[PDB]
A paper describes a structure:
Structural studies have shown that the side chains of the aromatic residue (Θ) within the core LIR motif are placed deep inside of a hydrophobic pocket (HP1) on the Atg8/LC3/GABARAP surface, formed between α‐helix 2 and β‐strand 2, while side chains of the hydrophobic LIR residues (Γ) occupies a second hydrophobic pocket (HP2) between β‐strand 2 and α‐helix 3 (reviewed in 3, 23, 24). To provide a molecular basis for the specificity of the PLEKHM1‐LIR interaction with the mATG8 proteins, we solved the crystal structures of PLEKHM1‐LIR in complex with the LC3A, LC3C, GABARAP and GABARAP‐L1 proteins.
To obtain the complex structures, we created chimeric proteins consisting of the mATG8 C‐terminally fused to the LIR sequence with a Gly/Ser linker. W635 interacts with E17 in GABARAP and GABARAP‐L1 with distances of 3.5 Å and 4.3 Å. Our structural analysis revealed that PLEKHM1‐LIR residues in positions of X1 and X2 also participate in the binding and could be important for the subfamily‐specific interaction's network (and EV4 and results in Appendix). Residue N637 at the X2 position formed more preferential contacts for binding of the GABARAP proteins due to better geometry of an intermolecular hydrogen bond to an invariant arginine residue in all GABARAP proteins that is lysine in all LC3 proteins. Additionally, in the GABARAP subfamily structures, this hydrogen bond is stabilized by coordinated cation–π interaction of R28 guanidinium moiety and corresponding Y25 aromatic side chain. V51 GABARAPs’ side chains are in close proximity to the PLEKHM1 V638 (3.8 and 4.3 Å for GABARAP and GABARAP‐L1, respectively), while side chains of residues in equivalent positions of LC3 subfamily proteins are further away (LC3A/B/C V54/V54/V60 – 4.2/4.6/4.6 Å).
Residue numbers in the entry: 1 to 122
Write the structure that this text describes.
């Protein structure tokens, strides 16, 4: 708005060229206007478990707090340990919805990229 968002390197972005990512992201957003296409990767330096899958298609009214719980169970992070999301190297508010987060932070390929970590700074 009206900025193009550029974030850190993701292995997804390295392995799928921009033109293919943008074609797919434009299609999924047209097909599902109220679902958010999210790429989730572990930050390189994080000392917690990896995810099986990295592509999530979620509700735009899902809260970030709800998405935290989802990722946490999927990496089997013990409840006592902290988990943090970074989008464009910023920690989003836990009260935001995935829809608001997408609107603010999506990249030019129409995807939203989230790195997760056990550290609260990066």
């Amino acid at each position: 708005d009206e900025w193009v968002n550029v974030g850190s390197k993701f292995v997804y972005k390295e392995e799928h060229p921009f033109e293919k990512r943008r074609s797919e992201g434009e299609k999924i957003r047209k097909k599902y206007p109220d679902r958010v296409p999210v790429i989730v990767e572990k930050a390189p330096k994080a000392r917690i478990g990896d995810l099986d899958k990295k592509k999530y298609l979620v509700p735009s009214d899902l809260t970030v707090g709800q998405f935290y719980f989802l990722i946490r169970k999927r990496i089997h992070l013990r409840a006592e340990d902290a988990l943090f999301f970074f989008v464009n190297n910023v920690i989003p508010p836990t009260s935001a919805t995935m829809g608001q987060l997408y609107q603010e932070h999506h990249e030019e390929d129409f995807f939203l990229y989230i790195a997760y970590s056990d550290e609260s700074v990066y």
